């Protein structure tokens, strides 16, 4: 028997928040403005 052990991350394991999915919920493109509450006028 010859085998191999690798130590590290597989880049295929992550954390996800319960009750949330990527594309289950269908919607459209959004835009908004936020100001006066950051650490002057942001449009994202």
């Amino acid at each position: 028997p010859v085998f191999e052990i690798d130590v590290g991350c597989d880049s295929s394991k992550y954390i996800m928040v319960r009750g949330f999915n990527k594309s289950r919920c269908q919607r459209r493109d959004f835009s908004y403005v936020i100001d006066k509450e950051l650490l002057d006028n942001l449009k994202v």
Binding site: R28, D29, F30, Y32
Partner: protein, 51 residues
């Protein structure tokens, strides 16, 4: 239409523009109506003594 579509609101679909003129500051209307009440009162007050 322009790029637009900031927040909106819909349930069965999306990208829906509401009809009618939108207002954010139309709140001087009660003051204007109260002053028109006073003006109408004092305009009706003038005709009876004339007759």
């Amino acid at each position: 239409i322009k790029e637009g579509l900031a927040a909106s609101d819909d349930e069965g679909q999306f990208i829906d523009a509401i009809a009618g003129t939108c207002d954010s500051d139309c709140l001087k209307l009660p003051l204007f109506f109260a002053f028109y009440f006073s003006a109408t009162v004092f305009s009706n007050m003038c005709s009876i003594p004339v007759i």
